[PDB]
């Protein structure tokens, strides 16, 4: 019964219809990341940014968007390992939650939540955020230049993990991209499941998430039957 | 620990 820590990146939701928030391209939905994902871009033109996420939140809840095979396998993995499992995601979508996972740590926030520019308090939110809402309100999404959420619990799980699995994460966004090193530093067996290479991993597989993830999860679960 | 969200 190994302790397992899984870190997921935008890639896993790609097959579900949620266009990967590129960064090497610098364009997220035809928008500059510095313009829609930095505290500066916001203060500069809040209306536009608000509109940008309103559109992201909207699309997130459309019929054609649902968890894929990779999300589901991760729910099966949690079902099996219970308290020895921890899922950390850099994603702001709720596909892991819809698949069946619980206690998912959203280090970069959640698209279906918001917070007030003054108190910071958080409250659920599924619709659009209009110029007429207050405790002012902004997306509960960690922008570049801001501090990730749950870092204390994440770092604790990393020091405790027997197996650290990084799924479809681009070795480009830190601190998340540095987790593999931490895990490896504490003796964990590191695994990388990605569409493509570019990511200290002892075991690695490449190909569509909905194919690679379920396969690895099955191998692992069977392996410790 | 870890620092702010950032891109290499
Ligand atoms: Zn307030």
Question: Would you summarize the structure shown here?
Answer:
The complex is a heterodimer of chains A (about 220) and B (about 10). With about 220 residues, chain A is of the alpha/beta class.
- The gross shape of chain A turns out to be globular
Helix content of chain B: under 10%
CATH topology of the largest domain in chain A: Rossmann fold
Q: What helical percentage do the residues of chain A reach? A: 25-40%
Using only C-alpha atoms, the radius of gyration of chain B works out to 6 Å
Subcellular location (chain A): Cytoplasm
Keywords (chain A): Cytoplasm, Metal-binding, NAD, Transferase, Zinc
Subunit structure (chain A): Forms a 1:1 complex with acetyl-CoA synthetase (Acs).
Binding site for substrate (chain A): 53, 56
Characterization of the model:
The complex is a heterodimer of chains A (225) and B (8). Chain A has helices at 11-14, 33-36, 39-44, 46-60, 69-81, 95-99, 151-160, 179-185, 209-223, and strands at residues 4-8, 27-28, 31-32, 85-89, 105-106, 109-116, 122-124, 137-141, 163-167, 173-174, 189-194, 203-206. With 225 residues, chain A is an alpha/beta fold. By secondary structure, chain B is mostly beta strands. Chain B starts with 5 loop residues before the first strand and ends with a strand. Chain A binds chain B through residues 23, 33, 108, 142-148, 151, 155, 171-175, 177-178, and chain B through 1-8. The site of zinc ion (ZN) has 4 residues of chain A, from loops.
């Amino acid at each position: 019964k190994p302790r397992v820590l899984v870190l997921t990146g935008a890639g896993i939701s790609a097959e579900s219809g949620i266009r990967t928030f590129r960064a090497a391209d610098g364009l997220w939905e035809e928008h500059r990341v510095e313009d829609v994902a930095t505290p500066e871009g916001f203060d500069r033109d809040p209306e536009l940014v608000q509109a940008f996420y309103n559109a992201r939140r909207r699309q997130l809840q459309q019929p054609e968007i649902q968890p894929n095979a990779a999300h589901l396998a991760l729910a099966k993995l949690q079902d099996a390992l219970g308290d020895r499992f921890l899922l950390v995601t850099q994603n702001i979508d709720n596909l892991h939650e819809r698949a069946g996972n619980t206690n998912v740590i959203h280090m970069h926030g959640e698209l279906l939540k918001v917070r007030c520019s003054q108190s910071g308090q958080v409250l659920d939110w599924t619709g659009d955020v209009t110029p007429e809402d207050k405790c002012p309100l902004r997306p509960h999404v960690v922008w570049f230049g801001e501090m990730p959420l749950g870092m204390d619990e994440i770092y604790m799980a990393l020091s405790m993990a027997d197996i650290f699995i990084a799924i479809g994460t681009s070795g480009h966004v830190y601190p998340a991209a540095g987790f593999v090193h931490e895990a490896k530093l504490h003796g964990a067996h590191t695994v990388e499941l990605n569409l493509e290479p570019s990511q200290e991993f002892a075991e690695k597989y490449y190909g569509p998430a909905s194919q690679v993830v379920p396969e690895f999860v099955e191998k692992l679960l069977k392996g410790l039957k | 620990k870890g620092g702010a969200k950032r891109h290499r």
